[model samples]
Target: LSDEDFKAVFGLTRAAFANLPLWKQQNLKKEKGLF
Candidate 1:
C-alpha cells in the first residue's frame, strides 16, 4: 500500500489491521497505542 493507505489504516477494522505488514503494524501499534 501507499503512504496514504498506511495513514488510513487507523480507520480500518482489526481484521484489516492484521493484514498489514509487520513493520506497519508495529508503527501503528506505537502511534495508535494498540497495546
Candidate 2:
C-alpha cells in the first residue's frame, strides 16, 4: 500500500474500520505491519 493508503486506513475510526470486510481489513493490517 502507498502512504496515502495507510493514511486513509489510519484515518478511519475503529468503528469505521470494523465495517470493512475481513479480508480487506487483514490486507490493510498486513500492509501496515500490524499482522
Residues 1-35, candidate 2: write the lDDT tens digits.
45456557666756666688998778768876565
Over 4 Å off, model 1: 1-9
lDDT of 2: 0.68
Give the Cα-based TM-score of candidate 2 against the true structure.
0.57
lDDT of 1: 0.73
lDDT at 6, model 2: 50
Please provide, for model 1 over 1-35, each residue's C-alpha lDDT reduced to its tens digit, 9 standing for 90 to 100: 55456457587766677899999878887887556
Estimate the TM-score of every prediction: 0.58, 0.57
* TM-score, cand. 1 vs. native: 0.58
Query: What's model 1's lDDT at 26?
Result: 87
